Amino acid sequence: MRVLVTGGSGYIGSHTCVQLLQNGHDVIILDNLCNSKRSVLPVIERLGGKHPTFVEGDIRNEALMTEILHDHAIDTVIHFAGLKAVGESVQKPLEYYDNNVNGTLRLISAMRAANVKNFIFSSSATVYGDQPKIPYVESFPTGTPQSPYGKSKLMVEQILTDLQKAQPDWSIALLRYFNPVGAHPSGDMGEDPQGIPNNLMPYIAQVAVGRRDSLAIFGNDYPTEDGTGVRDYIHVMDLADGIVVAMEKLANKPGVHIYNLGAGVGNSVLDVVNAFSKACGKPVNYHFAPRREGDLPAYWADASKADRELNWRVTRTLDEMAQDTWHWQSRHPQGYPD
Amino acid sequence: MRVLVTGGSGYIGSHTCVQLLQNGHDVIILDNLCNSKRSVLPVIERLGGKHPTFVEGDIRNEALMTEILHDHAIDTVIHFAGLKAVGESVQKPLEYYDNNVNGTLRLISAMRAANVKNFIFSSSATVYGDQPKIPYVESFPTGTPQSPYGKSKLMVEQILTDLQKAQPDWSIALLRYFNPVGAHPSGDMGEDPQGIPNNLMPYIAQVAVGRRDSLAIFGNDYPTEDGTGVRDYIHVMDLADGIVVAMEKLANKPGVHIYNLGAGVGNSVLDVVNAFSKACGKPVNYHFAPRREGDLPAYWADASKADRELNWRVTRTLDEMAQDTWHWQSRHPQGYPD
Numbered sequence A, B: 001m002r003v004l005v006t007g008g009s010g011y012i013g014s015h016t017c018v019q020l021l022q023n024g025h026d027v028i029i030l031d032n033l034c035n036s037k038r039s040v041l042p043v044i045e046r047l048g049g050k051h052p053t054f055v056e057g058d059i060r061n062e063a064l065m066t067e068i069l070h071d072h073a074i075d076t077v078i079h080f081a082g083l084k085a086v087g088e089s090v091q092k093p094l095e096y097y098d099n100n101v102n103g104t105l106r107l108i109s110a111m112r113a114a115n116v117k118n119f120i121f122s123s124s125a126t127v128y129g130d131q132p133k134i135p136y137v138e139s140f141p142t143g144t145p146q147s148p149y150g151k152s153k154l155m156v157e158q159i160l161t162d163l164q165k166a167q168p169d170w171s172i173a174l175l176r177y178f179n180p181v182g183a184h185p186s187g188d189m190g191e192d193p194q195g196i197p198n199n200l201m202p203y204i205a206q207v208a209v210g211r212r213d214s215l216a217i218f219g220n221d222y223p224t225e226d227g228t229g230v231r232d233y234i235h236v237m238d239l240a241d242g243i244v245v246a247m248e249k250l251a252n253k254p255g256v257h258i259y260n261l262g263a264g265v266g267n268s269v270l271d272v273v274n275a276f277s278k279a280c281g282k283p284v285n286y287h288f289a290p291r292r293e294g295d296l297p298a299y300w301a302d303a304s305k306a307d308r309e310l311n312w313r314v315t316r317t318l319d320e321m322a323q324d325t326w327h328w329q330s331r332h333p334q335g336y337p338d
């Protein structure tokens, strides 16, 4: 199929695009490069075995979206573009609602004008919020997300659900990713954000290669076993495989198809730090810090729905995620060329 | 004050602008004329006793909004612009989320650029959604809104609330209007949408002057006394006064200020029809149609908060609302000229 991958030079997107190209799909990447490096493109192409088209631009530019969709006869859209830092969103709400809500609205408006009716949305475990039972299950209601990032993702889910009710030929996947970590097994593609990483694992990896002095751990007084936050860590390669399976299986199947994509087990921040220390051979330096706004104490997935319906499940462990990120970072301590 | 009134040529806006101008404010009206007529402008000037400035344009045009804000040295913004039909929103969700959510986002992004920090938002009783506690009280939670229109308004409430947490010098009023009806007592300004009215009272009035054959009452099997929907009808002049009071009292008061603006009693569709037949002297032709998607059976306000805090409450009765609408419509059967 001919796939538009917004945010496709980013972390999840770059891994997804490799898998898409390996499966014979045609890939067009749209990215504004605010949180990724252009030089990942040829790495995607070498690992994927096929050339992806690149367009530098912004999902908020509806005119450009419409041009792309038409110029390439796109079949399906995988949407990764947006801003993703929970704590940052509390400080910069308008930027998150603009990139995430308006940006998705602009993209789906261009899709409706171009008659493209297959959408795979990068949602988040943060749409559940504080109320729902853990592990999270898709058949029980969401609650109140705890940050503008989380709220933005739930607002887009709702907008997309109401679009599909009005326009019932659409197929829309709401894929609630949990916490992807890890890197491609070659060690030549991994996470490389712009500036200081907001996510846990790339920060730890940059400490381990000597770029940053110490990890700050955001909270040690949570109601968790060791007092640090607990999350469901999923290897980015398993995540990317799930996304591709969803895209293929759900294209042209009308409805709103909701899946948790996670490993189904929780690990704490200190668990991740310990996993990485064993992979790299040295204790990763850290210090405790206050809780980050927008963080819940603990959550993890029930990913049985994706197992039953998509025949997908995780295959890699947290230790293997830490090993693959260390393999990447140690090979490329400054990330991609710039 | 120097007041920007988006949507100011519209129903509630035009009445509000007349009250603003009578209080000596400088008023700039911004409207795209999708649901109002430009020929209302001299009426607003005459009844207001003072000339407002008019700009034809769209709240989604951020650059234009910023220009108006700077040029006119705006102190506070009253935001009426948007789309407002519950049933239409179910059919046309994208247009609702764009005009309502992106439109408000573009406006408040302009205000951040121009350092304007006083906002009065037209919210709606539809944000309460399926909250079973009725009359609705501000200090009790919102439920799930039951249409894209209602969800759009609550999404904007949430965005504004997050903005004010990040930028705590903002003063933001979330004014949850109930169901405004009626017309200026002169009989020369009233409700005149483009096309076929979506709201109950302007449809009634256009049947009463012979422009429409029969009112469609949407549902006759609700769990109410007569089976028709129940709402809290508030005279538009009372609502205009309340908006003006809120603007004047809440300017430069940092915080998020939530008020229901309603009469605090419920009346059914048939109650309104009977009040109109009494006012016009002829029984209004009607029939029953199916329930309209998005509609709840019954709701009305607790408007005690506005009484205690803003010293505002309703003064006009349902019969006066119907008499004033008939006065307008019988004087001006075709509304304002095109």
Ligand SMILES: NC(=O)c1ccc[n+]([C@@H]2O[C@H](COP(=O)([O-])OP(=O)(O)OC[C@H]3O[C@@H](n4cnc5c(N)ncnc54)[C@H](O)[C@@H]3O)[C@@H](O)[C@H]2O)c1
Binding pocket: A006, A007, A008, A009, A010, A011, A012, A013, A030, A031, A032, A033, A034, A035, A036, A057, A058, A059, A060, A079, A080, A081, A082, A083, A084, A099, A103, A122, A123, A124, A125, A176, A177, A178, A179, A180
């Ligand atoms: N990483 C996670 O833990 C995680 C968890 C749940 C959901 N998600 C979601 O998955 C998606 C991808 O996350 P990621 O980890 O790959 O992040 P990322 O930052 O690596 O990828 C996002 C990409 O989008 C680009 N981008 C951002 N705003 C854009 C805009 N307006 N127009 C065009 N390009 C823009 C960035 O330059 C970047 O390449 C995001 O929607 C994110 O919210 C991520």
Ligand SMILES: NC(=O)c1ccc[n+]([C@@H]2O[C@H](COP(=O)([O-])OP(=O)(O)OC[C@H]3O[C@@H](n4cnc5c(N)ncnc54)[C@H](O)[C@@H]3O)[C@@H](O)[C@H]2O)c1
Binding pocket: B006, B007, B008, B009, B010, B011, B012, B013, B030, B031, B032, B033, B034, B035, B036, B057, B058, B059, B060, B079, B080, B081, B082, B083, B084, B099, B103, B122, B123, B124, B125, B176, B177, B178, B179, B180, B199
């Ligand atoms: N009438 C009600 O029962 C009611 C109840 C609760 C809340 N509200 C809210 O109050 C506000 C005003 O309601 P109203 O009854 O006066 O409706 P209205 O349609 O008469 O007024 C809205 C005005 O906004 C203009 N407009 C619409 N979209 C615009 C855009 N993108 N940019 C610029 N102008 C635009 C229209 O042309 C119109 O003049 C709306 O936000 C509405 O949702 C109305």
Ligand SMILES: O=c1ccn([C@@H]2O[C@H](COP(=O)(O)OP(=O)(O)O)[C@@H](O)[C@H]2O)c(=O)[nH]1
Binding pocket: A086, A179, A198, A199, A200, A201, A203, A215, A216, A217, A218, A219, A228, A229, A230, A231, A269, A292, A295
């Ligand atoms: O530098 C960091 C980044 C993250 N975290 C914690 O690590 C976990 C994962 O955070 P991340 O930002 O990667 O993803 P999130 O869970 O917000 O999606 C959460 O408990 C964060 O509080 C941390 O302690 N230090």
Ligand SMILES: O=c1ccn([C@@H]2O[C@H](COP(=O)(O)OP(=O)(O)O)[C@@H](O)[C@H]2O)c(=O)[nH]1
Binding pocket: B086, B179, B198, B199, B200, B201, B203, B215, B216, B217, B218, B219, B228, B229, B230, B231, B269, B292, B295
């Ligand atoms: O042509 C119409 C318009 C509205 N209504 C009913 O009148 C009440 C008020 O509807 P309106 O659309 O004016 O405002 P809403 O209550 O949706 O804000 C509701 O019970 C509607 O179902 C109706 O029966 N016929």
